[PDB]
């Protein structure tokens, strides 16, 4: 199997990331080792094969190295476009003759999430009261959005001043390939009963020491 | 040269997954091809490898309930995976991984969801509470709620509105249904904006034109 | 021969 470290890392634009893989046994021919890049919702993109050969159309600031059971991917002059998950994968084969039998397999590393640190940007926050047709369904969903921000934020919901702890789901987009920023949706789900039994609905997006709130009163929309 | 997985979709626990990998522009049988999968938000995982020499080699976890076979006559390879559980929910890929060869090729992947009928989304417009202070842009959205399985596709103005769209990754609720939102930011003089939501699994398409809130 | 003898 393949042990890939670190599982998460970060670098500033222009920096360097290094990713290591350790195989419990030696790869086939001491050659069969590729590195892949994957962004959300996409097929894996091959970066390197045969340990160190650059795949077609891959930038030269990706470099593969190693031998035997230890392998390294180095990303030089890292860019926001490099924000992705990376995987090593080795091939193994033994035997192949009548009296040996045979066995083959591939082993993917567990992956490395690479966060690229770009220029900090505070979020702008938007809140959307539930549509009138939502309430009729007996379930209400309030959407809060934190747009174009870096670094990460945390979201808090308040209902008439009382922090919420249930019914909240957050979904963050991948890092923007041009400027490294995130976007985030946070949704608060309530029954029509609870929603009609309260007035002020608040989403609070906190980034370090800075917090941005957006609020609405049920009676106004 | 390209490959293509057959359709996935919603499958009952205990059932059988069957996926076909069809090749175009080359002969599958002249290369070793693997099946790889990826559970939601987790890493890539090898299932088995159909070697160019015709022998199938399976990951230990897969050996007892997987079969990989080649159809040279039709230029396909097929994965059969039995006794499915929720743990088998994943994107499934056909791929020549290319650890050492110049040639590497991956299908686009197909989503297989173990959870019994699909559910079409309900779509609600997202509009700011009436109460602006004249800004230069306005941001509207659509909430796509309560569907199964993934995916849905969201466009704005039938695809003519391409900038300023943020469609968030879906989230699976405790009920097992999925939900997501899409927002679009437009200049404040914009005409009405309409979200178009398609759900192939239920064969549905919904259009919602977002109106301004009462004021 | 990339994946076998």
Q: To probe the interface with C, which of B30, B52, B98, B104 has the most C CB atoms within 10 Å?
A: B52
* Dihedral class, residue A68 (left if φ above 0, else alpha if ψ from -120 to 50, else beta): left
- The number of distinct structural domains making up chain A is 2
CATH 3.40.50.720 fits B122-209, yes or no: no
User: Chain C: residue nearest B97 by CA?
Assistant: C3
User: Are residues A91 and A51 part of one domain?
Assistant: yes
Q: In degrees, to the nearest 5, what angle opens at C-alpha B130 toward C-alphas B126 and B135?
A: 90
The 3-state DSSP class for residue A177 equals: coil
User: Are residues A63 and A19 part of one domain?
Assistant: yes
Q: State whether B43 and A29 contact (CB < 8 Å).
A: no
Do strands A2-5 and A70-76 pair parallel, antiparallel, or not at all (unpaired)?
Answer: unpaired
| Cβ burial, residue B200 (10 Å; 0-12/13-18/19+) | middle
- The size of chain C, in residues, is 5
Min Cα distance B52 → chain C (Å) is: 8
In sequence order, the 6+-apart residues with CB closer than 8 A to the CB of A59 are none
- A29 vs A68, A91, C3, CA distance in Å? 9, 9, 9
User: Are residues A129 and A110 part of one domain?
Assistant: no
Q: Token digits for A19?
A: 């990713």
Task: State the alpha helices, DSSP H only, in A126-180.
Answer: 132-135
Which approach determined this entry? X-ray
Give all chains having 3 or more CB-to-CB distances under 8 Å with chain C: A, B
User: Are residues A113 and A134 part of one domain?
Assistant: no
| CB proximity C1 to A under 8 Å | no
d(CA A215, CA B141): 17
Domain termination residue (choose one: A64, A99, A117): A117
Domain termination residue (choose one: A81, A102, A117): A117
| CB proximity A6 to B under 8 Å | no
- Minimal CA–CA distance to A75: which of A30, A112, A104? A112
Domain termination residue (choose one: A117, A137, A157): A117
User: Are residues A139 and A103 part of one domain?
Assistant: no
Q: Token digits for A186?
A: 């946070």
User: Are residues A104 and A155 part of one domain?
Assistant: no
User: Are residues A35 and A55 part of one domain?
Assistant: yes
Residue with tokens 């205990």: B14
d(CA A161, CA A164): 9
- B208 vs A20, A142, B195, CA distance in Å? 48, 18, 5
* Dihedral class, residue A26 (left if φ above 0, else alpha if ψ from -120 to 50, else beta): beta
d(CA A135, CA B43): 39
d(CA A204, CA A184): 12
Can you give the residue ranges of every domain in chain B?
Answer: 2-114, 122-209
User: Are residues A189 and A112 part of one domain?
Assistant: no
User: Are residues A113 and A7 part of one domain?
Assistant: yes
| Cβ burial, residue A91 (10 Å; 0-12/13-18/19+) | buried
Do strands B17-24 and B2-5 pair parallel, antiparallel, or not at all (unpaired)?
Answer: antiparallel
- Note which residues in 101-140 of chain B have CB less than 8 A from chain A: 101-102, 104, 106-109, 122, 124-131, 139
In sequence order, the 6+-apart residues with CB closer than 8 A to the CB of A139 are A189, A190, A191, A192
Q: State whether B100 and C4 contact (CB < 8 Å).
A: no
- This structure's resolution (angstroms)? 2.0
User: Are residues A80 and A34 part of one domain?
Assistant: yes
User: Are residues A133 and A46 part of one domain?
Assistant: no
**A205 near A146, Cβ under 8 Å?**
yes
The 3-state DSSP class for residue A156 equals: strand
User: Are residues A112 and A7 part of one domain?
Assistant: yes
Range of the domain at A132: 124-217
Q: Token digits for B184?
A: 């679009």
CATH of B2-114, one of 2.60.40.10, 3.40.1160.10, 1.10.260.40, 3.40.50.620: 2.60.40.10
User: Chain A: residue nearest C3 by CA?
Assistant: A93
- Note which residues in 52-81 of chain A have CB less than 8 A from chain B: 55
Output phi, psi for A109, to 5 deg: -60, 165
Domains B2-114 and B122-209 share a fold: yes
Q: Token digits for B179?
A: 């939900």
- Secondary structure (DSSP) of chain B: -EEEE---EEE-TT--EEEEEEEESS-GGGS-EEEEEE-TTS-EEEEEEE-TTS-EEE-TTTTTTEEEEEETTTTEEEEEE-S--GGG-EEEEEEE--SSSS--EE---EEEEE----BPPEEEEE-PPS-----SEEEEEEEEEEEBSS--EEEEGGGT--SSEEEPPPEE-TTS-EEEEEEEEEETT----EEEEEEGGGTEEEEEEPPPPP-
């Amino acid at each position: 199997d393949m042990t890939q470290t670190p599982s998460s890392t970060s670098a500033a634009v222009g920096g360097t990331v290094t990713i290591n893989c350790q195989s419990s046994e030696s790869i086939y021919n001491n050659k069969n080792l590729a590195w892949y890049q994957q962004k959300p919702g996409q097929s894996p993109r091959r970066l390197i094969y045969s340990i160190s050969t650059l795949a077609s159309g891959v930038s030269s600031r990706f470099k593969g190295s190693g031998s035997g059971t230890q392998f390294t991917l180095t990303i030089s002059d890292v860019q926001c476009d490099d924000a992705a998950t990376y995987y090593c994968v080795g091939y193994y084969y033994s035997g192949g003759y009548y009296y040996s039998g045979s066995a083959a397999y591939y082993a993917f590393g567990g992956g490395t999430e690479v966060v690229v640190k770009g220029d900090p940007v505070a979020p702008t926050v938007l809140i959307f009261p539930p549509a009138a047709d939502q309430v009729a369904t007996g379930t209400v969903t309030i959407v809060c959005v934190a747009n174009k921000y870096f670094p990460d934020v945390t979201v808090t919901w308040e209902v008439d001043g009382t922090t919420q702890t249930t019914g909240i789901e957050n979904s963050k987009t991948p890092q923007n390939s041009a400027d490294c920023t995130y976007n985030l949706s946070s949704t608060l789900t309530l029954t029509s009963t609870q929603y009609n039994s309260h007035k002020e609905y608040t989403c609070k997006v906190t980034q370090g020491t800075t917090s941005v709130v957006q609020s609405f009163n049920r009676g106004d929309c | 040269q390209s490959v293509e997985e057959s359709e996935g979709g919603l499958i009952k626990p205990g059932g059988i997954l069957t996926l076909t990998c069809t090749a175009s522009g080359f002969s599958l049988s002249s290369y070793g091809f693997s099946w790889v999968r990826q559970a939601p938000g987790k890493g890539l995982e090898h299932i088995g490898y159909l070697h160019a020499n015709g022998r199938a080699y399976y990951a230990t976890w897969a050996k007892s309930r997987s079969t990989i076979t080649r159809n040279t006559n039709l230029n396909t390879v097929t994965l059969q995976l039995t006794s499915l559980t929720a743990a088998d929910t994943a994107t499934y890929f056909c791929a020549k991984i290319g650890s050492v060869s110049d040639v590497a090729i991956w299908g686009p992947g197909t989503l297989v969801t173990i959870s019994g009928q699909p559910k079409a989304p309900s779509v609600f417009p997202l509009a700011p509470c009436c109460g602006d202070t004249p800004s230069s842009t306005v941001t509207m959205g659509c909430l796509v709620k309560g569907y199964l399985p993934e995916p849905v596709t969201v466009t704005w103005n039938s695809g003519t509105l391409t900038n300023g769209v943020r469609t968030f990754p879906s989230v699976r609720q405790s009920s097992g249904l999925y939900s997501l939102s899409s927002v679009v930011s437009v200049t404040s003089s914009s005409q009405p904006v309409t979200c178009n939501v398609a759900h192939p699994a239920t064969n549905t398409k919904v259009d919602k034109t977002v109106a301004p809130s009462t004021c | 021969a990339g994946x076998a003898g």
